[PDB]
């Protein structure tokens, strides 16, 4: 705490060169294992462009609607290997006609977790099993098998901990709220457990993914790959976690920061934006989310 | 830390008592000094019945747009009393129109705080200037005068720390989330600082607001108010979002009930719950902690 806290006004165009440190790219897929998972909300961004550089294709319950609404390009060239959840959104016809076509279906009626959890333990069970199963998950209890599977395959170590997945997540913020909490919570969580995870919230306003704390290393092409000729796009660093306060030091944000304390209840850096023509970076005290917008 | 930690399954209908305790009644403006705040956002919900009840109306900036734009049964009846913001997204002809119609022109060029805070600073300022100078917010310090003059006056002077206002703000939630992320964190700032000022985020899925530490009684008529007759009971959930962590949660009337529940990011957090309590219910907190409601 002793030392001065700076933010520095900084042109609009800066060249950061490369600084162990965390290196994200977040605009990849705008040009490992990639894994879309589509949750329930009508479905804006250039979905065809995402699903064709995806693994496979996960949709949380009422997300296989806003999957089939996104056609009315033919609907049966993207049929999603995964339909997730209670249940209680999907509609019957657009569950017969995706079961038709052979998307594994998994109900899980727990009331303990929700569509987007139990979607992601569908993804990792999938990623230990499949390649040994094709029908891994038949059978399994029907209320928490994902959940008991998961957490509870690592007490027999049969869990492969060395596997990197890129999770690109639709309609999982902007929503009701409480879900948008759960989904950054989740975020959190997920990278304590599973670092080599890496989650994308693609929204219809930014993407936003965490920064794990130590230094980070964001690159990109340049820009224009995703913020179209505000003569550059907006960012900024939510401390959202139980860990605070987060001391923050930035290099290629217009307002960038040094020895900067971040707390919610406190100072929070957002309509930030991005100097960088190539790059930036962010040291933190500890994991942290940041969003950027995108076009 | 020693208490069971219990979460009961109750039925979907429930009636709670009162409970000393913060009462709170989210939904009256569908069924008090009331000021609504317009950020840049489609507006969706019933304008015109939030506006009659309304005594002030501030747009932030771009919401000068949305307002504007929603329009597209006269607009001239309807002129916002401030219009606030570095005027980045307002438009020109925006801009005229209510300029010409006299809504109150107030731009603040400073980069260190977002037109949210600086509506909020106009809004808290009015109600201290405004009875007693018409236009107290000519010839301030076009960068950051509404921020020096508020909270460097804030203190032991002129300030007159009793006055209940609800602000109702639509188009904060939902956007760029490093906005609504701004947003929630100036709820928590403001209730420690302004605890008479209470604030509900209008959304186009729910409705936002803060439980404050102890004892919270939520009523209303019906919740058929604001949940129309898929699911039978309204959806909500408790949002850990502040630095103080964990908090500690006892509920009477959710349909996942808590007892001794600690609750925390990067922990267990209650959403996706759903409101048992036919005209109310009970929510007690160790500390504040953001609560939203499904409204359909
Ligand atoms: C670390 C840091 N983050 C953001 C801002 C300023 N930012 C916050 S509000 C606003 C104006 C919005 O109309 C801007 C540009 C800063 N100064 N320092
Ligand atoms: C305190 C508390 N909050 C929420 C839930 C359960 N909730 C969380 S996920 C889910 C199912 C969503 O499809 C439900 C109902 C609970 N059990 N206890
Ligand atoms: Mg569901
Ligand atoms: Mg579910
Ligand atoms: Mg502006
Ligand atoms: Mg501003």
């Known amino acids: 705490s002793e030392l001065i806290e700076q933010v520095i006004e900084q042109p609009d165009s800066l060249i950061i060169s490369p600084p162990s440190y965390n290196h994200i790219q977040p605009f990849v897929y705008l040009e490992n294992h990639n894994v879309l998972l589509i949750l329930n909300q009508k479905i804006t961004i250039d979905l065809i462009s995402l699903w064709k550089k995806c693994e496979i294709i996960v949709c949380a319950d009422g997300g296989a609607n806003s999957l089939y ?5 033919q609907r049966s060239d993207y049929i999603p290997d995964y339909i997730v959840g209670d249940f209680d ?12 076509h052979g998307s594994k279906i998994i109900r899980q009626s727990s009331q303990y977790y929700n569509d987007f ?14 390649h040994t199963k094709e029908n891994w998950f038949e059978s399994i209890d029907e209320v928490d098998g994902l959940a008991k599977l998961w957490n509870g395959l690592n007490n027999s170590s049969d869990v492969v901990v060395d596997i990197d997945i890129t999770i690109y997540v639709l309609n999982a913020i902007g929503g009701r709220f409480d879900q948008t909490v759960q989904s950054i919570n989740q975020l959190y969580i997920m990278n304590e457990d599973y670092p080599k995870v890496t989650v994308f919230f693609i929204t219809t306003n930014d993407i936003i993914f965490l920064l794990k704390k130590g230094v980070n290393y964001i690159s990109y092409k340049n820009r224009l ?11 900024g660093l939510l401390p959202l976690s139980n860990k605070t306060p987060i001391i923050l030091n930035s290099y290629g944000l217009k307002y960038d920061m040094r020895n900067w304390k971040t707390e919610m209840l406190g100072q929070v850096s957002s309509s930030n934006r991005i100097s960088g ?17 995108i076009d």
């Not at 790959?225 to 960012?235: E, I, L, V, Y």
């Open 69 to 73: 609404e996104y056609f009315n390009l």
């Open 89 to 100: 959104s999907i509609s019957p016809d657009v569950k017969t006609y995706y079961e038709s």
């Open 117 to 130: 959890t139990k979607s992601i333990h569908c993804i990792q069970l999938h990623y230990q099993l499949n």
């Open 225 to 235: 790959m995703f913020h179209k000729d505000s003569p550059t796009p907006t960012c």
């Open 277 to 293: 023509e190539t790059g930036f970076i962010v040291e933190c005290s500890d994991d942290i989310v940041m969003n950027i917008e």
